[PDB]
Design a protein around this ligand. Structure first.
Ligand code: HEM
Ligand SMILES: CC(=O)[C@H]1CC[C@H]2[C@@H]3CCC4=CC(=O)CC[C@]4(C)[C@H]3CC[C@]12C
Length: 459
């Protein structure tokens, strides 16, 4: 034994790279998820199959299917995601929860994300828009080429703490010692790490790990937020902990601690990561930074504070964020487990298989997109947009199980653009790598941290 599911795609009839005995196709991840997705797409068309060890992954590319599974069949057959490693009590974090515990948690926290409560958090978020620039200032002063993900990470931290726990620190490399270093440690998993590679060939190793209590969210940090939450509950006799406590807090109590940790996870390094790309695009395109920078002066006259409405009422900003997201869809892949045998717009799909949508690949897909390689915002203006197909462009997923934090993500990032642009300009310096080159790991990240010249707009 060792090639269990390896007959499935030759049978059923789907093309794809032919699996090694124990490894499946994992050896093709030397380029990363993105590059591996591009090629299978080219070299196989619109459906293809591969094996992560002995897990069969079926990538689909037709919008109709991609909508059947993401939308039309969510609660039906494609409800859950792929288990990925020893997850401990975090098994109750919504993004990890399965089937019925999921829908429960989903409608239960979704009220916690509605607009208007977005409205309310804004003054809190803007407050670190201020902090960010008071900080971003000094680094431009010194004349030194600022590392983006450091100023942005901090802001993201600042905004997570404040909106998630009503803890207002200026982490931002200042009070960098209280509550900051556990949070700092909540980074995206790299699923091409040797650790995760091992657990994909030997998934029989997850339960063992589970036993030794070896969890993939580090215990140091989980103890802390778990402790730190509980002490906050009592004291309280806007803020995500707030909105949950009020949320009838059934809705379990030490299941609340799982949400808190997972919101930080999903939002920390993603927000600060996208913000970096956006500032890279706005240099190598100085023209766009200006077109955007003027729009901002137009909507709020010299330095005026950004606002829930000041924001939504900025067509060009919305274009720049959206175009950055196309090039760099942080998740790279949407992905869904098949709960049962089902038919789906043509092809049979057998129970057990993982259905995979190639976000990043569809976003650079010479079909739907012309000069797909190019940062040009105009793709998303009132004319040229909305003949672009959702289910193709999906940087936040789609359907019952999409990014619950999308609005908050966008809002948060814009308030940060505003403050920064309406106050700065950004210029390739010595180190600035041009073009881009993505990491060939399992994260959709720069490879060599983006560093830029920050230059105060007159002072
Ligand atoms: C940089 C911005 C962000 C991007 C690009 C992003 C992207 C995504 C994607 C692609 C998914 C999976 C969608 C699917 O399965 O179809 C997702 C899920 C999720 N995201 Fe985000 N996200 C971002 C920010 C955030 C923030 C700030 C939060 C926290 C408030 C958050 C919370 C979640 C949660 C809880 C899920 C899981 C929903 C579920 O499985 O029921 N995200 N996100
Ligand atoms: C970068 C990343 O995704 C992290 C999250 C889970 C982490 C692993 C969790 C288990 C672990 C325990 C150890 O004592 C050595 C390091 C390892 C093997 C970790 C290495 C880095 C990983 C793979």
């Amino acid at each position: 034994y060792g090639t269990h599911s390896h007959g499935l795609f030759k049978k059923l009839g789907i093309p794809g790279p032919t699996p090694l005995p124990f490894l499946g196709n994992i050896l093709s991840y030397h380029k990363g998820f993105c590059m591996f997705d591009m090629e299978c797409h080219k070299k196989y068309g619109k459906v293809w199959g591969f094996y992560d060890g002995q897990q069969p992954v079926l990538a689909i590319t037709d919008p109709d299917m991609i909508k059947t599974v993401l939308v039309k069949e969510c609660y039906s057959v494609f409800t859950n995601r792929r288990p990925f490693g020893p997850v401990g009590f975090m098994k109750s974090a919504i993004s990890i929860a399965e089937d019925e515990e999921w829908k429960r948690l989903r409608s239960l926290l979704s009220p916690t994300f509605t607009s208007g409560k977005l409205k309310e958090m804004v003054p809190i978020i803007a407050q670190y828009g201020d902090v960010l620039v008071r900080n971003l200032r000094r680094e431009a002063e010194t004349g030194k080429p600022v590392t983006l993900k450091d100023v942005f990470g901090a802001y993201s931290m600042d905004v997570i703490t404040s909106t998630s726990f009503g803890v207002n620190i200026d982490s931002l490399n200042n009070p960098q010692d209280p509550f900051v270093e556990n949070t700092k440690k909540l980074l995206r998993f790299d699923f091409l790490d040797p650790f995760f590679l091992s657990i994909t060939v030997f998934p029989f190793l997850i339960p063992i790990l589970e036993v030794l209590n070896i969890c993939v969210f580090p215990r140091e940090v989980t103890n802390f937020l778990r402790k730190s939450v509980k002490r906050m509950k009592e004291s309280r006799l806007v803020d995500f902990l707030q909105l949950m406590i009020d949320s009838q807090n059934a809705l379990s109590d030490l299941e609340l601690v799982a949400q808190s940790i997972i919101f930080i996870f999903a939002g920390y390094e993603t927000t600060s990561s996208v913000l970096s790309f956006i500032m890279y695009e706005l240099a190598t395109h100085p023209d766009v930074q200006q077109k955007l920078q003027e729009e901002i002066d137009a909507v709020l006259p010299n330095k005026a504070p950004p606002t829930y409405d000041t924001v939504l009422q900025m067509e060009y900003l919305d274009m720049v964020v959206n175009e950055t997201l196309r090039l760099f869809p942080i998740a790279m892949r949407l992905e869904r487990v098949c709960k049962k045998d089902v038919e789906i717009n043509g092809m049979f799909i057998p129970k057990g298989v993982v259905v995979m949508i190639p976000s990043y690949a569809l976003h650079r897909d010479p079909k739907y997109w012309t000069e797909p390689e190019k940062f040009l915002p105009e793709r998303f203006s009132k004319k040229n947009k909305d003949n672009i197909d959702p289910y193709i462009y999906t940087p936040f997923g789609s359907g019952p199980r999409n990014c619950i934090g999308m609005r908050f993500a966008l809002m948060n990032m814009k308030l940060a653009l505003i403050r920064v642009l309406q106050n700065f300009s950004f210029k390739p310096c010595k180190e600035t790598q041009i073009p881009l080159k993505l990491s060939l790991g399992g994260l959709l990240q720069p490879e060599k941290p983006v560093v830029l010249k920050v230059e105060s707009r007159d002072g």
